[PDB]
Ligand binder design. Structure first.
Ligand SMILES: [Zn+2]
Length: 1211
RNA sequence: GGAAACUCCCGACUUCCUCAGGAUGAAGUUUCUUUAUCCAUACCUUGGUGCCGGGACGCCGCGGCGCCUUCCAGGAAGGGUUUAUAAGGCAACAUCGAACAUA
DNA sequence: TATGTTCGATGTTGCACTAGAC
DNA sequence: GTCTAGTGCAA
């Protein structure tokens, strides 16, 4: 038919296109002038693939608890976790730096008089120079250079020094310091023969520098300084940590709030140092330390060493230069404690395995931490300004300012004290307080500033959840919630009894109902039938659909008591459609059922009837599980009754009576609905606060009713990028005969790599060995290696595949095959389909195209909860080990260049999508004739619409234990979303066009459309952008040469700017405001909205219904009455509009509905999958759609095309 | 668009198409589709299918049956309706806010 | 405003080179 | 020649 590209072909089309993006073109250009292309300096993207790993059984795999334990070491902020220690370190008076050198200088702060020297430098050079202080000077000389920075030419030396000193390329400039670097650089080139020699001989270099400087001015001896600090260094070799006397120590403090202080402590110093950097970045520099570099020693050598030596006795006293008294030694005790507490690294090891250490996780750990640091620090600042910019009120002001100190001290801006744990507690409480008052705000506002709540202070967490413990808490939570449920229920009714305020138990509805219908309606007949409905519906709802005892039981009630016809009951109950009670003066009125004429039950009776029934199930529910389908239903009934029971009160309630008497442990937060307990008598408002128990009850109930879940532990370690290429040893390969006609394979036989079976069947493992050893580029056999039966596997992270012989080849990051030794039963086989596996190959054989990146090991332990001992107990089920391997598509390859000629206009039908293509060439007023037009199926859509209104139970799929809400709905949208973009992508290829899509305006369905737009159109928001780049392979924008478009921005207060034209850029899609794209006609070219407005601002229908317009003659029709009501239904043809309407004179509005009704007519057959008004015809007798018909999508598609086209009043 | 099915909901236990490549050929102006061995082993989704079960609607002589039409006396011309050539896949963690809806 | 559902979004990781000791 | 513990390099 018109079959579009899908799968690999579309991935190829999209990727190719990426390469044609504006940036990519730039990159290629750069290569001409640049010559060599950097992998990291060109467009790329990451494509992650997950492969479960087929670990062979008979492997020494650890218990999940053992696996679980480590993971927690890594991610939890409790004592015995890395986060604590890092926190302990700062808290307990220490500092972490990226390198060893910066550490030594810091400690020996005294030896280097940076303050004066800079002072002097300014006077003499008359400008402050970046990083030109003795302290920093020492590191620079001492530091080493890599890559092409090592080249020992005068120029390179100057280049580096320039950069280090923030000196700009000013050759012509006769700057005092600029000309000093040249002299210095020039005088350094001369006297040392390499950079490596410069580091070794660092006082000589220091000297020289001081010597040169001597000529310009009087400066102290750097080298002396260097020697001086050098003499006093006590620090362990390469320590990236140091102790500060100026620091404040806060040992033995709360784990929950420790993070708060360290950030605060560091933040405070940010100010002392008068740093120019952002606060967010100052702490990340100083906490984690620049790529986990600080922790590389600290987690491996600093940890080891800090357990083995004693705080004071080399004694960790002189090594870290502690206070001689114990002014600040309380500090070492807290960190010494932190180190032993952290368990030694365990059970994860490298190849030829030896255990991995905490230093191997520095990158990820730092990323986790710094992410939080960014977020938390941003909060405070938000908080402070948040603050800066009825006894309780008394409390606020008094208590408000104290909040400033909390925020300020937290932020490190107050040196009055370092924040107390209580400081923290106060903040929330205040939050507690402000919030109430805000509501009060709203309290008298509907009678007729924002003391709005303030945001939370962030926290950190992590580690596998304790499944059993959490479950048990729920169980106890549930028992207690029910228990206290009753008491609040019992007492309030009891209170009512004494004050005798109870309304008629069943009158309530009648009264309440009757209030709804604002009219006489005889005495009490019109409102009592509807009162009988209501009871039925409510109780009707609980058991409709369910197949439990109670549900069927309820059904029986309806059956025995004969409220409705059997057919009727079934449809309500069994088929699950239609309803017992219609809201009066219903706007939809979807054929309200007929309660049986015969039954003569009275409203008072039903409640007595129902009440009796209710009693029955209550006896029964006693024999069932709390977590049960039956109980679930009963609760539904119980709530209705209980509320109805509660609702029968005509007087307000005493606060002491209704106080929601539930302990705190069992619950957490009450929304704002419940922000009260002067003026607290609540007129029938106990219902909502009352509803809490159920909702609260429901949450725990859900958790315990969930049969399956999984817990996840994930690990990412530097250097975990090695995937292994192994041969399928057990198989015999019959190379096809026709393989030898190609020169390559011809070449293969000669090399004698191959080893045959007596039968002439190649043996893979044996042959594999040959290929490894035949000296040279392995690349010779890459083609064979791609054909030779092989498997991609991964080494067991816990055991040691030492290796005696070179079994297989192992592949790294940029394609780095390395003949390694693989043991038997030591590899895990990656499990995935062909396309997936193939990429893995490409990563090996073809690195420039794509290469492997660091992977993540994910261990999902699946647990399942089941009921025993009248409790829910969880038991471990299956463990799956998976590997997520990022694939970097360097791409950065070009093909035969091209551009978009046509345009793709897209419209979305609710049962698919429609398009229209226009040529770039036809840019004149006339001839905007669409090259092509059509529609595409896309079934998912109807599935989405048709499911959301059905409200069916979401598909059960394993959920993380952490997740407490269903994500089933989300995934589907993601899916539906995919197919929609696919087609557009598909269409795009054929027509070499770039799409134009309507801004949005079924609501579930809109969510997806919103998303679809994310993929093509340009948006700033990171989420929207991220989606796009995924599709277009990191591509940014494609600009069409020779075309451009008219833009119209705004200035201020919604004011029109100016019509400016610029070159046209498509991302690869652009947008158009679809204002009544649908109303207008594609062929006609005339909207109907014109007289719409014109007439509204300031009626001669004919016999068949003709109207005098400005632009033609609009012929409005009514339901044809030619053959009778019963018949069309007979064929199912929907009663077409062939019959005219002529009432002589019509209202302004009347035609509006008429025309409304008149254009988007519906479907030909009743048995359509379309309910939407799929068809629209231009009204004029002129338009060809009048007699013919069209699809709204195509039409709208066209208008859309045309409208956009006008814009590009460019060439 | 090739080949197929036939009213319409809600539920219950089975089968799995498609999939990335390598040396070939036979044809059809730098492409289109066929076909041989051969490596790649099939992950996560959206799905499809077979099956019972509980029901419903539109006719009809509590029960039979099921897309509308029309012509030979159960059969030949037409209409519609629905589709599988399946479709998608960038991971992870921690944080924060509320966000939509339904009558 | 009220009845029940749910996502929406920020921030971070998915380093690479080599002097000196294994 | 092999490896890892340091930390520079691009930003
Ligand atoms: Zn028209």
């Amino acid at each position: 038919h018109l079959h579009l590209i899908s799968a690999k072909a579309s991935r190829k089309y999209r990727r190719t296109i990426a390469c044609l993006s504006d940036t990519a073109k730039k990159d290629l250009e750069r290569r001409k002038q640049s010559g060599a292309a950097d992998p990291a300096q060109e467009l790329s993207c990451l494509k992650t693939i997950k492969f479960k790993l087929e670990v062979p059984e008979g492997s020494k795999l650890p218990s999940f608890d053992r696996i679980s334990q480590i993971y927690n070491a890594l991610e939890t902020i409790e004592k015995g976790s890395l986060s604590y220690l890092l926190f302990a370190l700062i808290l307990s008076g220490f500092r972490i730096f990226p390198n060893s050198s910066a550490a030594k200088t810091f400690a020996s702060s005294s030896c280097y008089k940076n303050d004066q020297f800079a002072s002097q430098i300014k006077e003499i050079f008359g400008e402050m120079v970046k990083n030109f202080i003795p302290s920093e000077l020492e590191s620079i000389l001492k530091k080493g250079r890599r890559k092409n920075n090592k080249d020992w030419t005068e120029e390179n030396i100057k280049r580096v020094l320039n950069s280090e000193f923030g000196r700009k390329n000013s050759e012509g400039s006769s700057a005092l310091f600029d000309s000093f670097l040249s002299k210095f650089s020039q005088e350094l080139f001369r006297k040392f023969d390499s950079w490596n020699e410069v580091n070794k001989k660092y006082l000589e270099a220091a000297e020289l520098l001081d010597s040169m400087l001597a000529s310009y001015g009087p400066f102290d001896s750097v080298c002396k300084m260097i020697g001086d600090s050098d003499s006093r260094n006590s620090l362990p070799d390469k320590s990236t940590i140091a102790f500060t006397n100026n620091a404040e120590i806060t040992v033995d403090i709360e784990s929950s709030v420790m993070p708060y202080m360290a950030i605060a402590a560091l933040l405070r110093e940010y100010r002392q140092s008068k740093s120019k950097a952002a606060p967010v970045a100052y702490v990340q520099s100083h906490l984690t330390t620049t790529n986990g570099n600080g922790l590389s020693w600290f987690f491996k050598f600093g940890l080891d060493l800090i357990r083995k030596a004693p705080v004071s006795s080399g004694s960790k006293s002189l090594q870290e230069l502690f206070s001689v008294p114990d002014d600040k030694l309380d500090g070492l005790k807290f960190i010494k404690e932190a180190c032993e507490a952290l368990p030694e690294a365990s059970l994860l090891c490298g190849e030829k395995g030896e255990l991995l250490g905490y230093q191997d996780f520095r990158t990820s750990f730092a990323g986790h931490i710094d992410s939080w640091v960014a977020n938390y620090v941003n909060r405070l600042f938000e908080l402070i300004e948040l603050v800066n910019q009825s006894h309780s009120l008394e409390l606020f002001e008094g208590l408000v300012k104290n909040v400033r100190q909390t925020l300020k001290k937290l932020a490190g801006i107050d040196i009055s004290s370092s924040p107390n744990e209580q400081d923290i507690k106060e903040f929330y409480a205040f939050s507690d307080v402000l919030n109430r008052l805000g509501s009060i705000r709203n309290q008298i506002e509907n009678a007729v500033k924002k003391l709005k709540k303030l945001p939370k202070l962030n926290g950190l967490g992590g580690g596998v959840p304790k499944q059993q413990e959490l479950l048990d808490k729920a169980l106890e939570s549930v028992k207690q919630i029910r228990h206290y449920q009753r008491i609040d229920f019992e007492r309030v009714i009891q209170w009512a009894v004494n004050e005798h305020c109870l309304e008629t138990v069943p009158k309530f509805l009648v009264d309440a109902e009757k209030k709804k219908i604002n009219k006489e309606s005889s005495t009490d007949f019109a409102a009592k039938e509807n009162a009988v409905r209501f009871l039925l519906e409510g109780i009707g709802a609980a058991a409709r659909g369910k197949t439990d005892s109670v549900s069927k039981a309820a059904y029986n009630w309806f059956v025995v008591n004969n409220f409705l016809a059997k057919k009727d009951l079934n449809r309500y109950f069994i088929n699950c459609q239609g309803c017992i009670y219609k809201p009066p003066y219903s706007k939809r009125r979807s054929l309200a059922f007929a309660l049986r004429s015969d039954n003569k039950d009275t409203i008072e009776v039903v409640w007595e009837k129902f009440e009796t029934f209710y009693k029955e199930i209550s006896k029964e529910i006693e024999k069932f599980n709390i977590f049960s389908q039956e109980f679930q239903t009963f609760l539904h009934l119980e709530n209705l009754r209980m509320k109805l029971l509660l609702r029968r009160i005509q007087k307000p309630i005493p606060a002491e009576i209704a106080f929601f008497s539930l302990p705190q442990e069992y619950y957490d937060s009450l929304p704002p609905n419940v922000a009260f307990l002067n003026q607290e008598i609540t007129p029938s408002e106990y219902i909502t606060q009352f509803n809490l128990y159920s909702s609260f009850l429901n949450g725990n109930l859900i958790l315990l009713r969930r049969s399956r879940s999984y817990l996840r532990a994930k690990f990412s370690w530097v250097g975990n990028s090695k995937l292994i290429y192994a041969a399928k040893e057990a198989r015999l390969w019959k190379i096809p005969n026709a393989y030898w006609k190609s020169d390559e394979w011809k070449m293969i036989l000669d090399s004698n790599v191959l080893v045959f079976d007596k039968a002439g069947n190649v043996l893979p493992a044996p042959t594999l060995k040959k290929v490894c050893e035949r000296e040279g580029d392995l690349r010779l056999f890459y083609p064979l290696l791609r054909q030779l039966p092989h498997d991609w596997c991964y080494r067991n992270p816990f055991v040691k595949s030492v290796g005696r012989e070179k079994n297989v080849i192992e592949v790294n990051k940029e394609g780095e095959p390395k003949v390694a030794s693989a043991l038997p039963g030591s590899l895990f086989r990656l499990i995935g389909p062909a396309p997936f596996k193939s990429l893995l190959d490409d990563c090996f054989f073809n690195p420039l195209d794509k290469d492997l990146r660091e992977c993540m090991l994910i261990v999902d332990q699946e647990i399942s909860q089941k009921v025993e001992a009248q409790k829910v107990e969880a038991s471990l089920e299956s463990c799956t080990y998976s590997i997520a391997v990022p694939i970097r598509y360097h791409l950065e390859e070009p093909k035969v260049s091209n551009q978009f000629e046509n345009v793709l206009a897209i419209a979305q039908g609710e049962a698919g999508l429609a398009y229209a293509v226009f040529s770039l060439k036809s840019i004149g007023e006339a001839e905007t004739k669409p090259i092509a037009v059509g529609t595409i199926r896309i079934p998912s859509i109807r599935r989405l619409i048709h499911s959301v209104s059905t409200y069916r139970k979401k598909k059960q799929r394993l959920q993380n234990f952490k997740q407490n809400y269903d994500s089933t709905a989300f995934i589907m949208r993601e899916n539906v979303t995919g197919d929609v973009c696919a087609k557009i992508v598909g269409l795009m290829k054929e027509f070499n066009a770039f799409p134009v899509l309507e801004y949005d305006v079924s609501r579930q369905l809109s969510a997806v459309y919103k998303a679809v737009n994310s993929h093509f159109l340009y948006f700033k928001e990171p989420g929207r952008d991220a989606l796009r780049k995924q599709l277009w392979y990191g591509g940014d924008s494609w600009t069409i040469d020779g075309i451009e478009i008219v833009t119209r921005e705004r200035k201020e207060d919604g004011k029109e700017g100016v019509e400016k034209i610029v070159p046209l850029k498509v991302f690869p899609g652009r947008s158009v405001s679809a204002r009544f794209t649908s109303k207008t006609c594609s062929c006609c070219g005339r909207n109907v909205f014109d007289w719409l407005f014109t007439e509204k601002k300031a009626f001669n229908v004919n016999s068949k219904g003709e109207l005098t317009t400005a632009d033609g003659v609009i012929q409005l029709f009514e339901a044809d009455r030619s053959k009778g009501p019963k018949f069309y239904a007979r064929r199912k043809e929907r009663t077409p509009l062939t019959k005219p309407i002529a009432k002589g004179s019509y209202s302004l509005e009347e035609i509006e509905r008429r025309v409304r009704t008149n254009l988007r007519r519906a479907p030909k057959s009743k048995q359509s999958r379309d309910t939407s008004q799929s068809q629209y015809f231009c009204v004029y007798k002129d338009c060809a759609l009048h007699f013919s018909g069209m699809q709204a999508d195509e039409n709208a598609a066209i208008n859309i095309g045309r409208r956009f086209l006008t814009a590009l009043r460019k060439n």
